[PDB]
Amino acid sequence: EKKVLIVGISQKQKDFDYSMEELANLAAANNMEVVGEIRQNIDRENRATYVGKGKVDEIKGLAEMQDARLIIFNDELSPSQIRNLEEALELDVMDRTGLILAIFANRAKTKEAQLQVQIAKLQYELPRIFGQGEDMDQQSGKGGLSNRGSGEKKIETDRRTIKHQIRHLQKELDMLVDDREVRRRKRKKNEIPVVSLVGYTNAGKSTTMNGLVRAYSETADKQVFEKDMLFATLETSVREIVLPDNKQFLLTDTVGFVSKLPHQLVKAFRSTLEEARDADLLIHVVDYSDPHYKTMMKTTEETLKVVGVEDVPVIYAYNKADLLEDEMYPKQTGNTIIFSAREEESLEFLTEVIRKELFASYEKATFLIPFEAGQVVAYLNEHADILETEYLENGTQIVAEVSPADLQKLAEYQVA
Amino acid sequence: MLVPKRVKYRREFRGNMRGRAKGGTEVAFGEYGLQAVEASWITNRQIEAARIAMTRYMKRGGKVWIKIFPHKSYTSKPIGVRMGKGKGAPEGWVSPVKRGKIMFEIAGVPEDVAREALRLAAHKLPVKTKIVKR
Amino acid sequence: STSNGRDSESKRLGAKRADGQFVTGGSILYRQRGTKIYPGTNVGRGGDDTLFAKTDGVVRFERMGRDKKKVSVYPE
RNA sequence: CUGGUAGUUAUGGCGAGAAGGUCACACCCGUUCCCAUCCCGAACACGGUAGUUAAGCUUCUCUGCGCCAAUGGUAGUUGGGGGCUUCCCCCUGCGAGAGUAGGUCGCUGCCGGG
RNA sequence: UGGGGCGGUCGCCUCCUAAAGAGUAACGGAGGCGCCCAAAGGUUCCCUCAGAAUGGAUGGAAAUCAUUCGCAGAGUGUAAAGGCACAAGGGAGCUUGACUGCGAGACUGACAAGUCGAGCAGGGACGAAAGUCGGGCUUAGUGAUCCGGUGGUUCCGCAUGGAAGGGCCAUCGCUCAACGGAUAAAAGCUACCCCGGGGAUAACAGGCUUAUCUCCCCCAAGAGUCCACAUCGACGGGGAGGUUUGGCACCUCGAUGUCGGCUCGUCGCAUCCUGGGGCUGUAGUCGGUCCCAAGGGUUGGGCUGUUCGCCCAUUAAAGCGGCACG
RNA sequence: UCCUAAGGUAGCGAAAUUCCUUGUCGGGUAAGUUCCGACCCGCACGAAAGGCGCAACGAUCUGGGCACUGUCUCAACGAGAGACUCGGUGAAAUUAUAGUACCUGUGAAGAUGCAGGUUACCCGCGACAGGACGGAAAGACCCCGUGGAGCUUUACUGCAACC
RNA sequence: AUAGGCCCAGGCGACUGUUUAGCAAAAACACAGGUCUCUGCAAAACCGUAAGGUGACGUAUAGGGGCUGACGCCUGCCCGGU
RNA sequence: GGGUAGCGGAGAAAUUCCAAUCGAACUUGGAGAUAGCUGGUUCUCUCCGAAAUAGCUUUAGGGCUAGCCUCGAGGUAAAGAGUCAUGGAGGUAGAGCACUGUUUGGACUAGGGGACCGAAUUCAGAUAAACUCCGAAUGCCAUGUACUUAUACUCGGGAGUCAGACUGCGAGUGAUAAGAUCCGUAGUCGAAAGGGAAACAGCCCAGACCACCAGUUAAGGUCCCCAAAUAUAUGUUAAGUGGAAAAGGAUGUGGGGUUGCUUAGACAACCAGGAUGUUGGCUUAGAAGCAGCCACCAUUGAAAGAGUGCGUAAUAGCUCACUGGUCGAGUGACCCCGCGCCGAAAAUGUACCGGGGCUAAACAUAUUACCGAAACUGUGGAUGAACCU
């Protein structure tokens, strides 16, 4: 495990004590031993070193007396700040932006995600080509009037050759959207309602789905990855849930997300967060035990705003209510639920909640199905919830709560 | 992923792969083996991939022996560097495999699953192989 | 960008006279470090471990006990 | 038979067991003298022989360890010729390492006592 | 010097490359040196290590004892290699051979230089004697000439006697380290530049290679409302092309004009549209993917020198590349 | 609280100065990497190398409008001087000898001349520029030469002048 | 036949003028104004080996040199180093 | 009309002007400055014939000494070359774990732990340019009186060379790329013509003294261009493979070796049966062989599953496993080997046999004739050296 160091400044932030300990957890995930940490209270970042010429001395001092090799900075660095910090430390440096890119590149097990990481990582290098251009300009070849060589300057050329790779990945990533819409064709051709779980990382998202599947799914042997790791899930998964009274819907998962996320990964997120934009309901799971939960909501709602997830009704779910002392879960107030995704009751209570938003238009009805030719009695007993059935001599009178698309699909069999 | 903890010298010659295997050409521990028919270099990533693909199929049943280890190391130069100015920085570890070497082992499972697991492993390696029995 | 690149000139060690070849007194028979060959009859060891004949004769590389050799000179 | 002293790549060594002797050789007794201990008559040096084969020493038996060691086969390879050239094949000459059949509880020379 | 510059290096010792004599290159792979010792040298006599187990223990994983096992698992001033237990390793006594004049004969070697040496003479140290001793177990610890300083001298001394001054022997003064040392004495800019040469050597274009790049596949964990293969396919593996970023330096320096546009085009198919067909998560409309097909088509503007890109408005469609980036 | 001789004041600020950069917001346009107005987050503004403004002036640089138009969509026609035919006079750069095709390949790695094929009766006149790595100029760019010259300095050694 | 196209906004330079005969007419040079410094007359400064001259047939409201460049508002801190 | 002259003058300053010339005018002299640099260097024949390497160098495209060439003269205890016999030094290829590193599985465990990590021991199995208990083939140094064969050495006069190239083998750098770069070893080119690779310095054969309208062969070839076999015998290929390219895929084709049933009737077909407790029991609105779970006997029989597939909604229905008969010659299961198939895409024009064209005029094994060079021979000439008369 590599030994690294953690550096950051205040610069008018409001959770500098919290945004500094994420960078410890983000470093643990990338398999680095955080040896020490540096904090400086300043109002604005330095234009040349990000910390001011003073503290550059005691990062060099501290990394020499702690055997560090890499320095992580809590915020993204300008190309010039990177250039100046290198020479002043003669050590590898890395900002927070590249720390997620190191996390995502090691946990992308599909080219769906692998292409998106790689295009975003290439857009990061384009501004740094200048510093690469500056150092490579020492051996400029020099001279003057050549009359027999090349076109423009070297800085023009090496900028063109890196933009060329970007547009190629853009073409490949554009064709990715066409592929994913083919797999949604059956869902969209029908009108199966879809509800998408969202929320901060380690909120209890997978734990919820893996419970609603083991209880109300025909193929219960289709579980998901629930663990203690940060960023366990990095994909969307769909599962068909069928309630005991013969109602069906689709439950989707989502990759969790953290604050200070690079703006060139949200463009990749925009693709992977498509199931939520078309969701007809959202479940916002929040880590209720952490006192930093109120701040967790803000960073996730300001993130759904970027990708176009809006106007979908939301129900806020507060997980981990077992840990809180004297908590009488489950309980519902407003659009808010208190539960723990471990007991069946919370999961049995949650399912009865969603039924109100999705299936509220299924109204009472009656029908008369002749015995001689049936094959509709089966249909009622699947696409409805029978209450009572009166097997008569004329045939089979039935009473059931059928969908509005089944009233007029069976408008001839209905009786008074 | 198999990597030696220590090395006396960082840089090494590349060597040659002439002749049959010096030893280890007979299956000893298990009852099924994967024997190379031609000679090739095997990196540690290929060993990892083959082992994973072969253990997943048996569903954590039986035992598997890795009969080769990547003692050697190899170096490389970045794009845009002229020739000279010393040797390159090491990149990975390889196991020079000569023909006739048995380099995987299976025991504790019947004929079918063992043969299928060996077949699944053999597609991850860059060398032509065959399945032998004790 | 290279810390290596240096060596020492060779010292031309080895055997300077062959077995069975007539040899003149005082001539070097073997240049060597330490004692890979021991001095036998009518031969001595120099300050830096060379072996030189002491009388005119014929060179012969015999064998001492199992794991070591010697060279001797026999007059005519 | 035994004491002394040399040669020979342990086939001679290590280990195990038995027998023997005051003819020789040792153990043994002593510190006045010559001589000695980073202290000590343990050793070395000197003066003696009440007791002993317990050990040293000699002889006898073994294959447990070690050591020496073929024949056949094989790898490799000089020369000549071929291929589908990470390397491979054919003809002639040379020819291992490992493994094994097997061998070993030594063989010789000189001087003094019995 | 895989163009030059920046970086690194320049002398000597040890090992691998070095292909079982010796020798053998690269800006190939690893290390050391520019000293130290008055005993860490000579001689005579004596003996033998690391480590492990058991008990006392102040005192533990580890101090100092006692027994047993123990071929070197230690040590050898120092880097490595070769060697050394009949010591070249460890003690004690006496001493200064860490001497003077030499040296048959050899090794190495273009020269200058470097290395070994029996034995003779003078006078000694240790030892009863035989005998050993011209520094250190062996190989690094060092620089010529010229010019000056210090000591000795039966040498010369410009008419003669002296002297001044030289000669000979011994010895001192170098990071002359760019270490066979140009001089006692030495840094930069040139886009205002000039001459003699070179494709022996760089920038454009051609050539070889294909790491990289584009495209095509093999196995199949998985995703896809169940469901590996409608549509994607991770970890790994195999090729084709010569459009990218690179490597090499083969033609051209007695000149091969170098970016974008304009005019004119012409080829390839890995097909953007149109034509024919298979599968579909193909009810219909709208689509996806693959197969056969190169016959014709494949816009007008705002910003930027821009190729490219973003945007406005259309279109059946607004293809990707080669031709000295035509 | 440390160090220094002391720690950038006013004014201005994506600038003839900002790499990231087409910074962010507003205006202008159907669409504005250029332009104007703001923010300050000044890689690397800043006070006589002057800082910030400023009426008049400018064959100065930059952005937008009215009018006007062959600059363009997209090219017609007409006049004159050449060019074209006839009579007079009459050069030059260049030049190894030439009865001087195309394709694929080979070769000092880009062939009219070499190999295999495919085409081609002999001689001219008016036109166009793909090739003859076409003509002109012993490449300026690059490197080399123990070549040169001009310039600088706390490189070495000197000289004038002054004390 | 001959005889101003006009308007809005910004950078630079205050203005008229000068400049690379033969690629660059400009934001570059000059300028009026500001400031620092040297010079008491055989003045300082400059040419010349000297004689002899310019400065000047002048005399500190005069003469030589450095920087800035109309005009308006201003021109901050440091004398350790040279 | 005059003034300022080059170690200088003038400059509202641009290295600007000083007779079409100015980062320092023109002219004559020193002067035939110097040039380790480029170019040039004129008649013939005869004999011999290299090098592109080492050390040092203000040295790297220059020089010096040595190495390699040539001419002359010397002296023999003949010293040069090849093979044979004999003796040696040396640790590479290979192999091995006896030392040192790297390393896999198992047993036990010091030590800490109120079971778990884990030092050392052992068992079995690997690995090494800078590991070695071992250790070749070649090469090298000598001895000989063995047998052949012609050089060696010393002294002196004269040089040139110090940019090398590719191919085979052994290594390094590189990516186990390059017509790359740098060494060792052998060859060819350089300095080599002739024949074959279509064309072609370096690949294969082979070394031109001159003439001939003579002969035999080498590499390579014999249907036509184009000299010589539409040769002989036995087989394989159907792909124009031959005449380009992998992982991977496959009822292509030929030859062998194994193994079930069968004229007391094999496989493929057709005719007939293919049933009863019973809808096996749970589960469900149901579940009747075929949503799911557990079980899976018996009855008649020659056979017949508490059911292989399709189907309903549950049924209904179609069909299979199995048995009897009908016709009457073989029919499935595995392994090895040879040759083929797909994978297979580029830019002026067929364009991955030189062309035509080939089903052999391709491939494998064996045999025999011929063609084929400036090679060797035959005939006639010219000439150098050594040694004899």
Ligand SMILES: Nc1nc2c(ncn2[C@@H]2O[C@H](COP(=O)(O)OP(=O)(O)CP(=O)(O)O)[C@@H](O)[C@H]2O)c(=O)[nH]1
């Ligand atoms: N104490 C407590 N822990 C819970 C509760 N629900 C889930 N967790 C824990 O939270 C941990 C985080 O796992 P989970 O939240 O499922 O992962 P995730 O939400 O998919 C993270 P991402 O959003 O990036 O995919 C789990 O280890 C789980 O045990 C709860 O109600 N109480």
Ligand SMILES: [Mg+2]
């Ligand atoms: Mg320049």
Ligand SMILES: [Mg+2]
């Ligand atoms: Mg240029």
Ligand SMILES: [Mg+2]
């Ligand atoms: Mg999740």
Ligand SMILES: [Mg+2]
């Ligand atoms: Mg050496």
Ligand SMILES: [Mg+2]
């Ligand atoms: Mg000595």
Ligand SMILES: [Mg+2]
């Ligand atoms: Mg010495």
Ligand SMILES: [Mg+2]
């Ligand atoms: Mg007796």
Ligand SMILES: [Mg+2]
């Ligand atoms: Mg006494």
Ligand SMILES: [Mg+2]
């Ligand atoms: Mg022995």
Ligand SMILES: [Mg+2]
């Ligand atoms: Mg044998």
Ligand SMILES: [Mg+2]
């Ligand atoms: Mg043997």
Ligand SMILES: [Mg+2]
């Ligand atoms: Mg050799």
Ligand SMILES: [Mg+2]
């Ligand atoms: Mg050698």
Ligand SMILES: [Mg+2]
């Ligand atoms: Mg070297």
Ligand SMILES: [Mg+2]
């Ligand atoms: Mg060093």
